[PDB]
Amino acid sequence: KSIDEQSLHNARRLFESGDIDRIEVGTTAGLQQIHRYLFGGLYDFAGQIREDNISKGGFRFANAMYLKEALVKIEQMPERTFEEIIAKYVEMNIAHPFLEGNGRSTRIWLDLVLKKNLKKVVNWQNVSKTLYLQAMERSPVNDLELRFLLKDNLTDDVDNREIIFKGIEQSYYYEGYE
């Protein structure tokens, strides 16, 4: 819980400082920069591609033995349309490259890709925890729930402090932290 508190402060600092603007967009290295920023000094494995296997619910995330190879192909996916970007996010979630903190880091990664390509980001504060988690769990089979949920909650006000900071708080709530 104290880990989350410091991590939340790191997420706030990432945007306050403008360091968010220095992150490589839509790449594996980019995701690793985010993870390192959020969790450096908190998880030993911050920024590091996992070597163990993990699952959640009935889903086993990409096998560690071919995770690196998968990430190579995932980062090459196109980013021109909303549908392409969500598909790319869905595959990066399936990769789930870190032992922990995949959700918070990859959502920031998603916003960067959406901002670069569509000049929008997700207004996370209005995205229900229940609906978001259900949609993610379904996304490997069908991303319809996710597309429906996120498309309704896009905003072109991408630097607004309230959207940014209330979104960081909801993002952290998705994995347990109030």
The binding site for ATP consists of 56, 93-96, 101-107, 129-132, 175
Residue where the block lists tokens 């901002």: 115
Query: Which residues fall in the annotated binding site?
Result: 56, 93-96, 101-107, 129-132, 175
Strands 59-60 and 121-122: unpaired
Query: In whole angstroms, what is the distance from residue 174 CA to residue 133 CA?
Result: 8
Rg (CA), the chain: 15
How is residue 128 annotated by DSSP? Answer: -
Q: What angle do CA 89, 93, 95 make, to 5 degrees?
A: 115
